Symmetry: C3
Subunit: 224 residues, 3 copies
């Protein structure tokens, strides 16, 4: 296809596909109720990402948004991906630390706003307003990062506290990159071109989903 | 109206309407917490289907998708219907057998993918790619059917095991037809015309919702 | 901006923003699991409304629908707001009275239909059909009001029964106004112009979210 970024969409599609299949097969025969939850949640993440990457590869998950006197290619399918995958990833962390339901509802709500405002930002036709929505989404992200950092995992089992610590550190570092990439890429300032932006989001997505999942499902904390 | 398929949309609308009202009235005065859940879930299904059928009848739930050198009438409102009604139907089955939450999340996730990929298939403008999404959706269906077949209902009460068995058999046979109808109808190969396709989906929908519901709500398994 | 209704969108945006911030700060340091739920739910409501009001102010949450030989400005962003905020408000009430899950699923389902059918009504191009969807949505509202009125709060604590009583009375009176405003405004009969309609919805929204929240979070019923 004539779009330069197809290769990274293709690699993205393939790597999410492989990860889905790996987690499916790994979770076969697992009978422990708690372990089953973590496998269900963690396998769905790349499964969803696979379908959205495929949509981008085939050209369905793309549209043109006019701003700055140009038709700009915007991959809306990312936000459809992230709307479902990011709360599931937060839920993996929340179930691990046995978080109360009020805290879970706060994280998921804020995540919905973060993703929702991002999408509005992506599709906004007035250039200046795009950054207002970015700012609001980033504020929502910071709230999530604050809750993850400031907790009671050290009060319970060592395997749980240890695995939470690493997945928290991975999450905070990888998630924080997303707003930076948006800002400097096609959606924001347009400093880095769409092909490099697509490469960047692919490394981040695969790392935040497949990499994250491998760390979690190899841990002993997912069992009671 | 000039569309030949209106009569089946009208019949569909009427039969979902009657079924909603029947289940509403039947569930009046029911105070048992478990029974109330099943009535809530089972009454919502035709209520949702009623609204979407009405949308199709009035022409709101229809759009034209260009493929194969023709503007093809696509009823998108079906997928809006099914996105909500199919997980509720799976939940009726899951609550009946007291399925663990990991298994419930797996079924609902896979169902979301099945319906989501179906819709993308429905709206895709490149003919060949429509069948790629059909295949992925069908793969998601098979996963759901595998989980329903391979379970622990025989470990618990006889009324529960008996009612699960029949509703499982109805579900598997009726659900399996949907991908066949899509494939041979307007959305796929275009072998059967839209009016017959609409008739076929109406028989299936009414049977999988109203018929299914009658079997469930007349059973003694819904009570503790 | 050239739209007369901007001032009420601006005031709406500001008042939801202030309310979000007030509830955020008030809920800091609250460690009681039950209280945390109510703060999570109640803070998300204006947070969501803030983002949608902002969308309307900036012009994103608006589209033109042709009916009656005129392009009519329709703020679709309201329905996006209400789809999420109204079930959360019902959940505040349901958790307060310790409602069973069947009843919670009934309320939330009916609320989804109410909002969903409202949106279809809003975007329908055949004038007469707009009122059919209004009628169906209003029927769904009446069901919700019936469940709220006809319950067991008097069986449990006095602070809970007392706070439920006032929030029920506020809810029923404020919610009942919404269908009246739609009917007489731009979406329906077009008797009151869009600027007054926008003023009316803003008073209602702020009262049903911020006012409602203040009453709830100052009560002692949110604690165990
Ligand atoms: C599986 C993929 C993951 C974990 C994606 C995470 C994405 C974010 C944390 C995106 C954040 C954004 C902002 C906070 C600023 C606005 C632009 C977004 C949506 C990229
Ligand atoms: C109440 C209606 C029900 C139970 C509908 C069920 C629909 C399906 C199981 C549809 C399945 C499809 C595929 C697996 C292939 C792609 C086309 C679909 C979405 C019709
Ligand atoms: C936070 C805002 C609230 C509580 C909004 C409530 C809105 C309604 C109860 C709207 C009801 C409607 C009908 C029942 C008739 C159709 C038009 C609607 C959607 C305005």
């Amino acid at each position: 296809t004539g779009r330069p970024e197809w290769i990274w969409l293709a690699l993205g599609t393939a790597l999410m596909g492989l990860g889905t299949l790996y987690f499916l097969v790994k979770g076969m025969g697992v009978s422990d109720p708690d372990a089953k939850k973590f496998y269900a949640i963690t396998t769905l993440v790349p499964a969803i990402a696979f379908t959205m990457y495929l949509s981008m590869l085939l050209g369905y998950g793309l549209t043109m948004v006019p701003f700055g006197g140009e038709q700009n290619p915007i991959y809306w399918a990312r936000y459809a991906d992230w709307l479902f995958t990011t709360p599931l990833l937060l839920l993996d962390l929340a179930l691990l630390v046995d978080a109360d339901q009020g805290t879970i509802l706060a994280l998921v709500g804020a995540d919905g706003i973060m993703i929702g405002t991002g999408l509005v930002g992506a599709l906004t036709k007035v250039y200046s307003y795009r950054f207002v929505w970015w700012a609001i989404s980033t504020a929502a992200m910071l709230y999530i990062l604050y809750v993850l950092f400031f907790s009671k995992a050290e009060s319970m089992r060592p395997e749980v506290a240890s695995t939470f610590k690493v997945l928290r550190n991975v999450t905070v570092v990888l998630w924080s990159a997303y707003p930076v990439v948006w800002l400097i890429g096609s959606e924001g300032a347009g400093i880095v071109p769409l092909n490099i932006e697509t490469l960047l989001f692919m490394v981040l997505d695969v790392s935040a989903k497949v990499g994250f999942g491998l760390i979690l499902l190899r841990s002993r904390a997912i069992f009671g």
